[PDB]
Every structure is written in C-alpha cells, then in structure tokens.
Amino acid sequence: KLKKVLDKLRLKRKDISEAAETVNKVVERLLRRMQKRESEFKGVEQLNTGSYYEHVKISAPNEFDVMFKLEVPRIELQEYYETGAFYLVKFNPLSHFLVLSATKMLSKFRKIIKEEVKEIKDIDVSVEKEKPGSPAVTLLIRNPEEISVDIILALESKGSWPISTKEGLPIQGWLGTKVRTNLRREPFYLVPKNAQGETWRLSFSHTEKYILNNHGIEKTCCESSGAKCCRKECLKLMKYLLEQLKKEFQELDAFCSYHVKTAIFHMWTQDPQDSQWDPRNLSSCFDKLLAFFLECLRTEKLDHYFIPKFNLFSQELIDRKSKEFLSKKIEYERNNGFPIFDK
Amino acid sequence: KLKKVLDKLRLKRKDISEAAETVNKVVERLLRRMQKRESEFKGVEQLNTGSYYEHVKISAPNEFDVMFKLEVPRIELQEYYETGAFYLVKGNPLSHFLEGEVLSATKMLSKFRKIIKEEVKEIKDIDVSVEKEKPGSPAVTLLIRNPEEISVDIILALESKGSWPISTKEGLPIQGWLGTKVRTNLRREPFYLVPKNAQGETWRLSFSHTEKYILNNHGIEKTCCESSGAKCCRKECLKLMKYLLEQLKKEFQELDAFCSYHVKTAIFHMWTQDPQDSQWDPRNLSSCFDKLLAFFLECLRTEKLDHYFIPKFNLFSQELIDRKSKEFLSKKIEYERNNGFPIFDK
DNA sequence: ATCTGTACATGTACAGAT
DNA sequence: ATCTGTACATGTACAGAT
DNA sequence: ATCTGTACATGTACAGAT
DNA sequence: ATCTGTACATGTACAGAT
Ligand SMILES: Nc1ncnc2c1ncn2[C@@H]1O[C@H](COP(=O)(O)O[C@@H]2[C@H](O)[C@@H](COP(=O)(O)OP(=O)(O)OP(=O)(O)O)O[C@H]2n2cnc3c(=O)[nH]cnc32)[C@@H](O)[C@H]1O
Ligand SMILES: Nc1ncnc2c1ncn2[C@@H]1O[C@H](COP(=O)(O)OP(=O)(O)OP(=O)(O)O)[C@@H](O)[C@H]1O
Ligand SMILES: [Mg+2]
Ligand SMILES: [Mg+2]
Ligand SMILES: [Zn+2]
Ligand SMILES: [Zn+2]
C-alpha cells in the first residue's frame, strides 16, 4: 500500500550514478574557480546539504543543494529586530562588500559563477534567473534529464551559537545531551536570504544532515547490526503528499518541504523511541505525522526546530486561507486512501 | 545490600578535590619539562586514562593514570611472533633510541624516566618520590603523600595515526551494542604503543583512550545515564567486581597474577553479550553482578579471556597465569558469591 | 608590525553533596 | 530535587619571537 | 595548502531462502 | 510477501604525500 508508494518514490542507482557524475563535474569546477582565482571567496569550502545527501530525496535525483561555506574572522551579529533567524553581520578580503551586505556579496558570488558556467562546454548548464530574497545560485543542468543545483553562499562562524537558539534543538530525551552539546560546538552558518538587503539567515543544514543520519535513540537504528525504523520513510511519504498537492494547487505556493522536515523533527522529539517508528507500524506512524502537521496548521504554529521563537506558520508568513486550504486537502487524502499517491 | 557497598566505595568530593589539585600540579610541571630544550620528548601530549577518568575508581582517589603520548610519523610495525599485542617499531629527535632502524622501548623509557626523576627532585611544594621500577611495566610511578598516599602512573606512549594493526581487525565487537558508526569512528582514532616488555625493544598496543570513550558512552541508547535518560548499573557492576578483586588481592598473594584489567575486559564482553540498557536495570543490580561473576568464573575455568581489542590474545592463557592461580580465584569467588560476600564487610 | 605556542575563557556532563 | 567541583572540548588573547 | 588513497556508512538490485 | 546475502554505487573523514 504505502510500501508500493515508496517503491515508486525510490531512486534508481543508474539515475543516481549519471546525475551525480555530472553535478560533481560542475560543482568541482565552480569550487576550483572560487580559490584558484584571486577572488574574495578564496578558502571557500564545500558542504553538501539537503534531501539527496540525507537520503530522503524522492522520485528522481534531480535536485542537489551545496553550501560554499566561508570561514570569517571574529564576527559580530545583531538580531534583525526579534525575528530569531535573521541578523546583520559586522566586524582583509571582504572589505568591498561593506555592515556586511548579503546582496552585494551574493551578487559578486553570482557574477563569478555565471562567468564560470559560460566557459563550460562539456555539459548543458545555464544559470536560472534570480529569485529575489533567495540565497541560492541555481543551475539548470540537462543530461537528457532536468537537474537543478542550488549553490548556497554561507558564512561560517566558530563562535557559540546565537542566543535565539539557546532553547532550540530539544534533542535531550531523544539523541541526548552529549550529542546536543557536541552539535552546538560545531560552527553555525549564515546564508544571504533577505527579509533587508543586508540581512542574513541562520542555517543548520549541517546539523539537520547529522540528525537525519543519526536519528535513533539507539545507536544501531538503521545500521547493519541494528533494527530498521521507518522515520525516513515517513518523511518521504509526507514530502510526496506535499509535492503532489503543491503541483496541483497553486494555493499551496507558500508551503515547502522544509515545513514538513521541521514538523517531523518535532515528531521525532515527541516520539523518541525507535519502537514508536517500527516498519510494521508505517501506516499509523505516517498517520500520526499527518495528525501533527494538521495541528500545526490549525493552531497556525510550526516553530523552527533550532530557533523556537521563529514560527514558520505565523500569519505574517502564510495566510489562514492557505493553511485551511491545505488542512482540507490533507484531511481529504487521509480519509479517502490517498488517491493522489496513485498519480 | 550492594547499594550499601557502593556507598562505601563512592569517592568523597573533598578527597577528590585535594588529590586532584596536587596530581595536576605535578603532571603539568612534568609535562612542561618534556617540551623544554632539546628534549627527545618535545611535542609529547597528555591523555588521562584509567579508572579515575572513567568514573569507576573506588574507595579513595589514590591512583591516577596518565599517558604522555608522542606522535611518531612514518612508522613500520612488525608483530612480535603472532602475539597480537606486542610489536617492534621501525638528525631526528628519537635517533638516540635506535638500534639500526629499531626503536628501543627500554632505552627510550630509561631517558623518559631519567628526566622525570630529575624534575621531581626539583619539587619542594609537595612530598613526592619516584617508585622503584617494576619489571614488565611501561609506567613511571610517582608516590605523592599529601598527608594521604596517592600514586600516579606516567605512561610513555607512541601515537600512530595509521590504520589499527591487523590483529585488531576482528576486535572491538561493538556493532550490536554501540554500533558500526561508533566503531568506524573509534578505529579512525590513533592507536598507542607502550614500552611493556616480552625483548627490550618490544612495545604493547594500548586502547586506554578507546576504553575511556566506551566507559563514558556505554549504552545502546544515547541517553543512558544522562539527565534526560535512564540510569543503568553497568559501571556499578564494574565497581563491585573491581572491589571483590582488590579486597581478595590484598589478602591473598596467590592472586598477584590478576589485575583490574581482567575484570574490565570480562565486563566489556558482558556488555557486548547483553547490549540492551534494560539488561542493566538498576533494580536488577544483584543478578547483573551475579551474571558477571558467573561469566568471569567461566573464563577462569576454561582458561580463556580474550583481549577485547585483540581477540587472539588470551589474557588467561596458561603461559600468562597458572591453572593453580585460576582455580584458587574460582574458589574464592564462588565462596563470596554463596555466602553473602563477607569480604565486602571489611 | 605580525605571528604563535601557551594559557585561559567558556560551556557542559557526570557525579557527589545538599 | 537542586547545587557544585572537576574534567574536558573548543575557541581566543597575547607576551615573546620573528 | 591541495590532492589522493583507504575504509566504511548509507543506498540500490536481485536471487535464493523463509 | 518478507528476509538475508552479495554485489555494486555514491558519499565522506582523514592520513600521508606533495
Ligand atoms: N538556511 C539555509 N541553508 C541551506 N540552504 C538554504 C537555506 N535557506 C535556503 N536554502 C536553499 O536556498 C534554496 C531556496 O530556498 P528558499 O528559502 O527560497 O526556499 C526553500 C526551498 O524552496 C525549500 C526546499 O529546500 P531544499 O531544496 O533544501 O529542500 P530539501 O530538504 O533538500 O528537500 P527537497 O529538495 O527534496 O525538497 O525550502 C525552503 N526553505 C525555507 N527555509 C529553509 C531552511 O531553513 N532550509 C532549507 N530550505 C528552506 C534551496 O536550495 C534551499 O535549500
Ligand atoms: N595488561 C594490560 N593490557 C592492556 N591495557 C592495560 C593493561 N593493564 C592496564 N591497562 C590499561 O591501563 C589503564 C590503567 O591501568 P590500572 O591498572 O590503573 O587500571 P584502571 O582501569 O585505572 O583501574 P584501577 O587503577 O582502579 O585498578 C587501564 O584502564 C587500561 O586501559
Ligand atoms: Mg533538496
Ligand atoms: Mg586508576
Ligand atoms: Zn532508523
Ligand atoms: Zn548507563
């Protein structure tokens, strides 16, 4: 039933092989260009993020997310009002992006990438028209197949995480206090998503990657000498429900995969035991996930998992209309055996 | 009953405070000295090991173990006659300890020892001498007196960052317990060679750093023994077993061949055999301790206790310990077991 | 003026003390 | 149930060296 | 400072056993 | 239908060499 759906959603090794071989060619070349040429981004380092690298990518290997992270000296943050997620950066190579302007820096980053792509004749690859606000430089590759790659500029700070995250990452009952303390000793990242043009947003893609690949209360969850859980499978099913709904109804344009990822982090925290995510109980697990996501919509509350004061479902970010709309559509699919899965 | 014993065994904060304040003074000074002038041990780094740093030290804070580890690039090992544990190592600073390519353990240890003795002489803050050398030991042992007697084993160590030696490939069977990711990461840590004998150029592998990790990350659940997790009795069983041996050892010299490492090894095997945190419930301390004794007794009777990291190395081989010694310890354990542990009452 | 090995600053888990 | 000392990991400041 | 080699985890694909 | 074993593929951390 849902096994049958996950089978459809499963990526093929051949497709993975071909898609990766190309994406890596391009990314390696873009990365080479940032240092081996005397740009402001010399020393920038690669960090693969998102669904493909978490092993929760569904349908096809056609969307890849990569951080080009840049370690910066002693940095001063100032929270953009009380948003929790957005900051101004303050205090050498970067002088010419001065307060460090996100858009000015992103523009140069973008300009370089556009130049390097022009010089690529191996592969059919253009640079997508800029979406204002967005921190990505998006590449549209065509093998025969359409593949998109988000190159995300990132500042890496080695200081302790900003105050807004102090109560974030409530993994203590699930992954534990040692894991949490160690995770919060990793750097934090700022990406140039706006709000305006000088605002950066916190990024925990590196932390989310760790969590995805170390998601059990037991150290052996999903390992060769351990028991398989269905945590990732539920994430996939939920992602697919949204993807399918999103491509049918334009009313759902305000919703994205990060909403679902956030909700399931909360579910995993609420239901820490690996036994509460037994493969045999895939149906009820998926169901309790839907129920939870519906409560978030109804209460208009979905807190950033790392930044509790940042509500992704705040009125200011998404209309009541949009939420009620998605509620009805989810409720419908739920109470009619998920017809949309059959497409 | 056993809670009451563990209460006695528990260290006091006051004693910990005083003992540590002194030990650290001495060790910091000894370590500072190694970095001086054209010392062959410049770059040597500190790594605290053993029971005190694993939180399984019992009775008093009176024995501390410290590795002074020294990174040695481009190093070639040759296993000493298929033993698994022992190896030969082959204007550089260590040049002075070589015998045509071969790094002498004893020559190196001797210099190490000489330096330490010299540095201790110059300490008048604290009452601290250097214990007479124990044959078949890699340690330089300090006897500090505070008022109270405290000993500190300074252990010379080579640090190699290469892959662990072949003999350990089947070692550390933690896959069903701590997992494959933990194991892979652990085996990416360096391995250590200490100058224990067999001859004067032989070194022995050391996994004290790994054992420390295991002790402090001993559960199948990541929250085992944490503030938002469930307490197990794994460490408590180790303490009780250590105490049984310590008490027996200081009464009967027949038990001189036995050490705390034997019990530590046995319990690593027990933890592997019983991976679930529920199999080590605090409420079931008695049966947990009992199954541990039963296991240790089987090891003695079958004369088999494999090094947890080096499976082919049997710590209870006839060549290391007499049948007599094992049977003796068997009877004494069996006795304590079947008479309510009278020796705990001392 | 810049660079650096060393010491310190900051944070938390663990366990003992209250 | 809360509070506190020690160990340990990671970041950063800086007197002495260059 | 950069690059390659090695080991193994997380996947997929599929046959034979249950 | 599911489970187990093997083969094949990609990702990633880190050591040793340059
Ligand atoms: N903080 C960030 N760290 C890393 N990458 C980021 C971050 N913020 C944004 N990005 C990347 O920028 C591109 C566009 O982002 P938008 O902010 O315009 O909207 C995001 C996007 O449309 C959607 C899905 O993101 P992603 O492709 O990473 O999803 P996935 O988890 O890989 O799954 P699938 O590819 O299978 O769907 O989510 C939106 N979004 C909103 N907030 C966030 C956030 O904090 N992190 C990530 N996405 C977010 C994208 O490439 C995005 O990754
Ligand atoms: N025979 C041995 N083989 C391998 N490692 C050993 C051996 N003996 C001791 N060690 C290592 O040296 C460490 C310190 O030795 P020591 O005898 O002090 O034991 P311990 O675990 O500290 O317990 P305690 O000191 O309370 O008896 C041990 O924890 C272990 O890692
Ligand atoms: Mg993605
Ligand atoms: Mg000790
Ligand atoms: Zn799992
Ligand atoms: Zn425990």
mmCIF file with all atom_site columns, N, CA and C in Angstrom, chain B residues 67-100:
data_model
loop_
_atom_site.group_PDB
_atom_site.id
_atom_site.type_symbol
_atom_site.label_atom_id
_atom_site.label_alt_id
_atom_site.label_comp_id
_atom_site.label_asym_id
_atom_site.label_entity_id
_atom_site.label_seq_id
_atom_site.pdbx_PDB_ins_code
_atom_site.Cartn_x
_atom_site.Cartn_y
_atom_site.Cartn_z
_atom_site.occupancy
_atom_site.B_iso_or_equiv
_atom_site.pdbx_formal_charge
_atom_site.auth_seq_id
_atom_site.auth_comp_id
_atom_site.auth_asym_id
_atom_site.auth_atom_id
_atom_site.pdbx_PDB_model_num
ATOM 1   N N  . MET B 1 67  ? 48.769 9.152   30.223 1.00 0.00 ? 67  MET B N  1
ATOM 2   C CA . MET B 1 67  ? 49.631 8.892   29.073 1.00 0.00 ? 67  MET B CA 1
ATOM 3   C C  . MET B 1 67  ? 50.290 10.188  28.652 1.00 0.00 ? 67  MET B C  1
ATOM 4   N N  . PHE B 1 68  ? 51.613 10.138  28.489 1.00 0.00 ? 68  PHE B N  1
ATOM 5   C CA . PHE B 1 68  ? 52.364 11.146  27.780 1.00 0.00 ? 68  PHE B CA 1
ATOM 6   C C  . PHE B 1 68  ? 52.610 10.539  26.417 1.00 0.00 ? 68  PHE B C  1
ATOM 7   N N  . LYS B 1 69  ? 51.741 10.891  25.463 1.00 0.00 ? 69  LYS B N  1
ATOM 8   C CA . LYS B 1 69  ? 51.744 10.293  24.136 1.00 0.00 ? 69  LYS B CA 1
ATOM 9   C C  . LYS B 1 69  ? 52.538 11.175  23.180 1.00 0.00 ? 69  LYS B C  1
ATOM 10  N N  . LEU B 1 70  ? 53.287 10.532  22.280 1.00 0.00 ? 70  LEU B N  1
ATOM 11  C CA . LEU B 1 70  ? 54.195 11.210  21.371 1.00 0.00 ? 70  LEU B CA 1
ATOM 12  C C  . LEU B 1 70  ? 53.934 10.729  19.952 1.00 0.00 ? 70  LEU B C  1
ATOM 13  N N  . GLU B 1 71  ? 53.510 11.654  19.078 1.00 0.00 ? 71  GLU B N  1
ATOM 14  C CA . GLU B 1 71  ? 53.225 11.341  17.685 1.00 0.00 ? 71  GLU B CA 1
ATOM 15  C C  . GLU B 1 71  ? 54.516 11.089  16.931 1.00 0.00 ? 71  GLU B C  1
ATOM 16  N N  . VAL B 1 72  ? 54.554 9.942   16.246 1.00 0.00 ? 72  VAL B N  1
ATOM 17  C CA . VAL B 1 72  ? 55.705 9.453   15.522 1.00 0.00 ? 72  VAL B CA 1
ATOM 18  C C  . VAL B 1 72  ? 55.254 9.136   14.099 1.00 0.00 ? 72  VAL B C  1
ATOM 19  N N  . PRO B 1 73  ? 55.440 10.062  13.129 1.00 0.00 ? 73  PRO B N  1
ATOM 20  C CA . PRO B 1 73  ? 55.038 9.816   11.743 1.00 0.00 ? 73  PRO B CA 1
ATOM 21  C C  . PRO B 1 73  ? 55.710 8.560   11.167 1.00 0.00 ? 73  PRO B C  1
ATOM 22  N N  . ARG B 1 74  ? 55.437 8.260   9.894  1.00 0.00 ? 74  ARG B N  1
ATOM 23  C CA . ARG B 1 74  ? 56.082 7.188   9.082  1.00 0.00 ? 74  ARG B CA 1
ATOM 24  C C  . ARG B 1 74  ? 56.699 6.088   9.962  1.00 0.00 ? 74  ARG B C  1
ATOM 25  N N  . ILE B 1 75  ? 55.883 5.145   10.448 1.00 0.00 ? 75  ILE B N  1
ATOM 26  C CA . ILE B 1 75  ? 56.332 4.122   11.374 1.00 0.00 ? 75  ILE B CA 1
ATOM 27  C C  . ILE B 1 75  ? 55.945 2.740   10.858 1.00 0.00 ? 75  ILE B C  1
ATOM 28  N N  . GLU B 1 76  ? 56.868 1.782   10.960 1.00 0.00 ? 76  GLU B N  1
ATOM 29  C CA . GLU B 1 76  ? 56.641 0.428   10.478 1.00 0.00 ? 76  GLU B CA 1
ATOM 30  C C  . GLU B 1 76  ? 56.611 -0.528  11.651 1.00 0.00 ? 76  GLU B C  1
ATOM 31  N N  . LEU B 1 77  ? 55.513 -1.281  11.759 1.00 0.00 ? 77  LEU B N  1
ATOM 32  C CA . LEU B 1 77  ? 55.331 -2.281  12.807 1.00 0.00 ? 77  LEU B CA 1
ATOM 33  C C  . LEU B 1 77  ? 55.665 -3.654  12.284 1.00 0.00 ? 77  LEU B C  1
ATOM 34  N N  . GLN B 1 78  ? 56.145 -4.502  13.192 1.00 0.00 ? 78  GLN B N  1
ATOM 35  C CA . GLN B 1 78  ? 56.356 -5.902  12.930 1.00 0.00 ? 78  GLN B CA 1
ATOM 36  C C  . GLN B 1 78  ? 55.894 -6.626  14.168 1.00 0.00 ? 78  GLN B C  1
ATOM 37  N N  . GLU B 1 79  ? 54.834 -7.421  14.025 1.00 0.00 ? 79  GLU B N  1
ATOM 38  C CA . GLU B 1 79  ? 54.265 -8.175  15.124 1.00 0.00 ? 79  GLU B CA 1
ATOM 39  C C  . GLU B 1 79  ? 55.308 -9.127  15.672 1.00 0.00 ? 79  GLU B C  1
ATOM 40  N N  . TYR B 1 80  ? 55.463 -9.121  16.997 1.00 0.00 ? 80  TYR B N  1
ATOM 41  C CA . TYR B 1 80  ? 56.406 -9.993  17.736 1.00 0.00 ? 80  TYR B CA 1
ATOM 42  C C  . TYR B 1 80  ? 55.784 -11.389 17.835 1.00 0.00 ? 80  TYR B C  1
ATOM 43  N N  . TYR B 1 81  ? 56.129 -12.290 16.908 1.00 0.00 ? 81  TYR B N  1
ATOM 44  C CA . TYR B 1 81  ? 55.757 -13.730 16.928 1.00 0.00 ? 81  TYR B CA 1
ATOM 45  C C  . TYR B 1 81  ? 54.248 -13.951 17.121 1.00 0.00 ? 81  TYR B C  1
ATOM 46  N N  . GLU B 1 82  ? 53.408 -13.368 16.260 1.00 0.00 ? 82  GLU B N  1
ATOM 47  C CA . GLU B 1 82  ? 51.977 -13.672 16.218 1.00 0.00 ? 82  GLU B CA 1
ATOM 48  C C  . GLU B 1 82  ? 51.234 -13.488 17.556 1.00 0.00 ? 82  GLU B C  1
ATOM 49  N N  . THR B 1 83  ? 51.788 -12.687 18.475 1.00 0.00 ? 83  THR B N  1
ATOM 50  C CA . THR B 1 83  ? 51.181 -12.476 19.794 1.00 0.00 ? 83  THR B CA 1
ATOM 51  C C  . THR B 1 83  ? 49.951 -11.573 19.740 1.00 0.00 ? 83  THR B C  1
ATOM 52  N N  . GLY B 1 84  ? 49.923 -10.667 18.759 1.00 0.00 ? 84  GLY B N  1
ATOM 53  C CA . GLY B 1 84  ? 48.809 -9.769  18.563 1.00 0.00 ? 84  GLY B CA 1
ATOM 54  C C  . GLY B 1 84  ? 48.957 -8.456  19.284 1.00 0.00 ? 84  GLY B C  1
ATOM 55  N N  . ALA B 1 85  ? 49.490 -8.498  20.511 1.00 0.00 ? 85  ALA B N  1
ATOM 56  C CA . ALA B 1 85  ? 49.626 -7.314  21.360 1.00 0.00 ? 85  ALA B CA 1
ATOM 57  C C  . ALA B 1 85  ? 50.986 -6.621  21.266 1.00 0.00 ? 85  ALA B C  1
ATOM 58  N N  . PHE B 1 86  ? 52.032 -7.386  20.937 1.00 0.00 ? 86  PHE B N  1
ATOM 59  C CA . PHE B 1 86  ? 53.416 -6.911  21.005 1.00 0.00 ? 86  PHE B CA 1
ATOM 60  C C  . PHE B 1 86  ? 54.009 -6.743  19.630 1.00 0.00 ? 86  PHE B C  1
ATOM 61  N N  . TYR B 1 87  ? 54.805 -5.681  19.470 1.00 0.00 ? 87  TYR B N  1
ATOM 62  C CA . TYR B 1 87  ? 55.369 -5.230  18.173 1.00 0.00 ? 87  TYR B CA 1
ATOM 63  C C  . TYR B 1 87  ? 56.783 -4.668  18.357 1.00 0.00 ? 87  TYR B C  1
ATOM 64  N N  . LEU B 1 88  ? 57.583 -4.728  17.287 1.00 0.00 ? 88  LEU B N  1
ATOM 65  C CA . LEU B 1 88  ? 58.791 -3.935  17.107 1.00 0.00 ? 88  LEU B CA 1
ATOM 66  C C  . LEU B 1 88  ? 58.441 -2.724  16.249 1.00 0.00 ? 88  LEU B C  1
ATOM 67  N N  . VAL B 1 89  ? 59.020 -1.569  16.594 1.00 0.00 ? 89  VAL B N  1
ATOM 68  C CA . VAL B 1 89  ? 58.840 -0.322  15.861 1.00 0.00 ? 89  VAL B CA 1
ATOM 69  C C  . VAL B 1 89  ? 60.096 -0.001  15.051 1.00 0.00 ? 89  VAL B C  1
ATOM 70  N N  . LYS B 1 90  ? 59.907 0.430   13.796 1.00 0.00 ? 90  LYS B N  1
ATOM 71  C CA . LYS B 1 90  ? 60.996 0.763   12.871 1.00 0.00 ? 90  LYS B CA 1
ATOM 72  C C  . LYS B 1 90  ? 60.689 1.997   12.036 1.00 0.00 ? 90  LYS B C  1
ATOM 73  N N  . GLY B 1 91  ? 68.839 14.227  11.470 1.00 0.00 ? 91  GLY B N  1
ATOM 74  C CA . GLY B 1 91  ? 69.014 14.491  12.889 1.00 0.00 ? 91  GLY B CA 1
ATOM 75  C C  . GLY B 1 91  ? 67.726 14.483  13.710 1.00 0.00 ? 91  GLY B C  1
ATOM 76  N N  . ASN B 1 92  ? 66.874 13.477  13.466 1.00 0.00 ? 92  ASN B N  1
ATOM 77  C CA . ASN B 1 92  ? 65.582 13.293  14.151 1.00 0.00 ? 92  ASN B CA 1
ATOM 78  C C  . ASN B 1 92  ? 65.731 13.157  15.669 1.00 0.00 ? 92  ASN B C  1
ATOM 79  N N  . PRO B 1 93  ? 64.757 13.628  16.491 1.00 0.00 ? 93  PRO B N  1
ATOM 80  C CA . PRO B 1 93  ? 64.904 13.643  17.951 1.00 0.00 ? 93  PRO B CA 1
ATOM 81  C C  . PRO B 1 93  ? 65.065 12.261  18.606 1.00 0.00 ? 93  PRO B C  1
ATOM 82  N N  . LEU B 1 94  ? 64.342 11.252  18.105 1.00 0.00 ? 94  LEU B N  1
ATOM 83  C CA . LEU B 1 94  ? 64.426 9.884   18.614 1.00 0.00 ? 94  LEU B CA 1
ATOM 84  C C  . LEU B 1 94  ? 65.621 9.083   18.130 1.00 0.00 ? 94  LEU B C  1
ATOM 85  N N  . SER B 1 95  ? 66.391 9.644   17.189 1.00 0.00 ? 95  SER B N  1
ATOM 86  C CA . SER B 1 95  ? 67.593 8.998   16.664 1.00 0.00 ? 95  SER B CA 1
ATOM 87  C C  . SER B 1 95  ? 68.375 8.286   17.763 1.00 0.00 ? 95  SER B C  1
ATOM 88  N N  . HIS B 1 96  ? 68.436 8.908   18.945 1.00 0.00 ? 96  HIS B N  1
ATOM 89  C CA . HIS B 1 96  ? 69.265 8.435   20.059 1.00 0.00 ? 96  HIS B CA 1
ATOM 90  C C  . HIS B 1 96  ? 68.767 7.130   20.724 1.00 0.00 ? 96  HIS B C  1
ATOM 91  N N  . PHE B 1 97  ? 67.568 6.660   20.349 1.00 0.00 ? 97  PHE B N  1
ATOM 92  C CA . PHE B 1 97  ? 66.971 5.435   20.895 1.00 0.00 ? 97  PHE B CA 1
ATOM 93  C C  . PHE B 1 97  ? 66.871 4.297   19.872 1.00 0.00 ? 97  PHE B C  1
ATOM 94  N N  . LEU B 1 98  ? 67.648 4.396   18.787 1.00 0.00 ? 98  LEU B N  1
ATOM 95  C CA . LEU B 1 98  ? 67.560 3.466   17.661 1.00 0.00 ? 98  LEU B CA 1
ATOM 96  C C  . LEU B 1 98  ? 68.640 2.390   17.747 1.00 0.00 ? 98  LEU B C  1
ATOM 97  N N  . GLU B 1 99  ? 68.325 1.225   17.169 1.00 0.00 ? 99  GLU B N  1
ATOM 98  C CA . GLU B 1 99  ? 69.252 0.115   17.014 1.00 0.00 ? 99  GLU B CA 1
ATOM 99  C C  . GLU B 1 99  ? 69.122 -0.377  15.588 1.00 0.00 ? 99  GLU B C  1
ATOM 100 N N  . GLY B 1 100 ? 69.700 0.393   14.659 1.00 0.00 ? 100 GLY B N  1
ATOM 101 C CA . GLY B 1 100 ? 69.580 0.137   13.242 1.00 0.00 ? 100 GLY B CA 1
ATOM 102 C C  . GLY B 1 100 ? 68.117 -0.007  12.886 1.00 0.00 ? 100 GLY B C  1
#
